[PDB]
Design a protein around this ligand. Sequence first.
Ligand code: ATP
Ligand code: ATP
Ligand code: ADP
Ligand code: MG
Ligand code: MG
Ligand code: MG
Lengths: 48, 303, 375, 70
Amino acid sequence: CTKIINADSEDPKYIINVKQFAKFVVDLSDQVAPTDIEEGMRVGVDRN
Amino acid sequence: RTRLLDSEIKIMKSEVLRVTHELQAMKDKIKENSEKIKVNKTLPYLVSNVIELLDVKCAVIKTSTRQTYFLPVIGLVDAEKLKPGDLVGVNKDSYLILETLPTEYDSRVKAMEVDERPTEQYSDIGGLDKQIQELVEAIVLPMNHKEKFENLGIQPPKGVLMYGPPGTGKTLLARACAAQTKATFLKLAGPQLVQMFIGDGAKLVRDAFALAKEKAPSIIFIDELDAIGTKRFDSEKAGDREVQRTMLELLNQLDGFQPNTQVKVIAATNRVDILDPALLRSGRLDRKIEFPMPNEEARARIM
Amino acid sequence: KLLEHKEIDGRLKELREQLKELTKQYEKSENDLKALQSVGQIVGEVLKQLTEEKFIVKATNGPRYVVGCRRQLDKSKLKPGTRVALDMTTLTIMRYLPREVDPLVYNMSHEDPGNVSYSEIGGLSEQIRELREVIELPLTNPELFQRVGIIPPKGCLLYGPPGTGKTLLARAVASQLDCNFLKVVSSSIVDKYIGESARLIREMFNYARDHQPCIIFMDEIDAIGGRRFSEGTSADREIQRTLMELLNQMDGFDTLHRVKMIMATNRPDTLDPALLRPGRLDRKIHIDLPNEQARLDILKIHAGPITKHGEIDYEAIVKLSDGFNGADLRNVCTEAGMFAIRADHDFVVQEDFMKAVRKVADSKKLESKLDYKPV
Amino acid sequence: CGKTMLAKAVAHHTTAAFIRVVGSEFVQKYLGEGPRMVRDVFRLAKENAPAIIFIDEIDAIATKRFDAQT
Ligand SMILES: Nc1ncnc2c1ncn2[C@@H]1O[C@H](COP(=O)(O)OP(=O)(O)OP(=O)(O)O)[C@@H](O)[C@H]1O
Ligand SMILES: Nc1ncnc2c1ncn2[C@@H]1O[C@H](COP(=O)(O)OP(=O)(O)OP(=O)(O)O)[C@@H](O)[C@H]1O
Ligand SMILES: Nc1ncnc2c1ncn2[C@@H]1O[C@H](COP(=O)(O)OP(=O)(O)O)[C@@H](O)[C@H]1O
Ligand SMILES: [Mg+2]
Ligand SMILES: [Mg+2]
Ligand SMILES: [Mg+2]
């Protein structure tokens, strides 16, 4: 589980953050809509 | 007509080379984009910071796993649009920079932005029409008549301060002006700029005045300024120091080295003698207006 | 006739143009086809040298390694102290590097396009010649000091009441050097990590020795200066470590030469006596409230581009201006137009100036009025 | 009062090895670097010579109060 910094326009391209490690640029899965992935929200994220 | 059949042979042969020419570029783009989307579907981007851009065309980056790397080849982004201090998107395994990420904003600064437009109108505020006027014209006129101050030629006033007894209405003008001007209104609490770790309250101030630097029409509001603006003191053996650091940048990030006329500051306290005189100088906070208690006729108007 | 040959060239040259321009869009996109095979390189540092081939390094990550090189990369030049690049997979040395320049300091060096000059400052030309004496005179003419037999001072600080021109005076110096003038806000240099507050003060002054004619400017040192403590909170533990790194890099075991330091504060009451020592801060320049001749001067500087009418008695404004700063005289020139901004007078009458003084004169009734004294 | 000055004069007329550290550099960023940085100073003063260690501003290291939570 992680924490989201922000989204950006034209694309999903979400900026994510974790506890001490780096920040990534991530994507959704198919099972969830891009509605309730609002900014500043903790989300669960696979390890690969 | 003799050379018309020989020059038509030179035209018909080269035009047939154009059929293989457009077929040459149409075929070249598959194998190049088959690997270009391959490094785009390596979408996890270990973001970093560009430390330095070499010349013997090369760059040194520091990933956010606290790892530094050297690269001989820069990558999909050229060297002109980059500069030290930027933050980019880097491949995981190759450690090759791919994109250019825009900004670096704390999420606590994003909570400070209003998106609600709290509607209050000036007729709700009785008995302050002297104070209502000189607050509007000292803020709104440098946003809607820019040339009018430059027609004469002066620098416009920067920073207002309202003070007085606690029930006289100080938030009420600030909620009025958030409903009038359609600019970037940005609000602050007093003790919001106090953090457990060192430097975080200092970093939180410069993020706000950089975010209001971006929205060039913007005014910034500070409520209960005596939380951070307490007067400094010399003491051995004890004493807070860390809250002075957030103030001493708020002095500097407002006024001093590299000034600007793009943001306006509205500050509201109810006690003044607590404050450090370094932030009541003339140039940091210009117009110090006071809100007295209503005399007789305003009390008829208020109720 | 060859006129039918020129008509046929308009199709062939338009056909060969679709070969070069369409492949040029395939040319640059072919550069990325093989640019995506270079691998990043671990940045390390050489510790000593065992044999011709046995090298021993430490990365900027962590652990210390024992490493080899290529046989072509000038093994005599890897001095203990240098900064090198490594391999990721086999972990060998590929390339020597120069020093790093830590982009907080790169974004501290030359980001000021400010173009103010000595004409804009007024009222304190006695101290301007005094301040010139340490940063401009021995940098151009060192032999006069060598003939007498004394060393020029290292650095001096500027103290005074708020709004007399302590920041402004250094901005006049800032428009003179433009590459080796280092201005520091003294609050960007602190963060929440362990030693990163003290790594900058090392690496600022390392950058100062690399550009030998250079000036360090240190505004609002009361954040980092302090006195000392009997250790109240846990925050000011590691600030005094950041402070004692500063005191040592001035005059401990180093020829502090050609590196001048200029410091400013509103109150020097809260400074460490180890930092106000005449070894580290040499002269103490006191800036005061402006005199009536100085208030005459500062007013005329800020009353320049004011569209007025020629009846301005500049004496009576100064006659009421008692105990003012250099900053509120800019406010009087500002607020005089605020009476012109009502009733649409594009000019400024002389009457509005005496209106402007009397509103500033009682707005500073709520000040504190403590001068201040370095002790 | 010539604290640093007298150490300069000793390190000029000496015949022994002189090791000169600033005592605010043991606080490295990474964990464990500092205690490694201590123990190889005295190992270098062991292997080299009948040497001399000079440490300045021990107030950066040796204080009185501590806090095992930060
Ligand atoms: N002697 C002067 N001549 C002209 N302008 C002055 C003078 N002194 C102050 N000012 C004006 O005052 C404003 C503030 O200057 P500055 O910030 O240098 O004050 P300061 O001495 O740095 O006070 P503080 O250290 O508290 O910030 C400047 O915009 C400058 O125009
Ligand atoms: N014979 C002397 N006795 C004392 N001080 C001297 C003598 N000759 C010169 N000094 C001056 O004393 C200054 C301080 O030297 P030094 O740095 O050793 O003092 P210190 O006690 O180490 O002070 P600090 O610990 O604050 O650095 C020198 O820069 C020098 O100018
Ligand atoms: N015309 C008025 N003048 C003064 N106060 C008013 C007026 N109209 C409403 N108020 C009341 O003043 C309050 C504003 O609080 P305020 O005095 O700004 O708090 P503080 O000054 O301590 O931040 C509102 O709750 C409002 O009910
Ligand atoms: Mg309030
Ligand atoms: Mg200043
Ligand atoms: Mg000493």
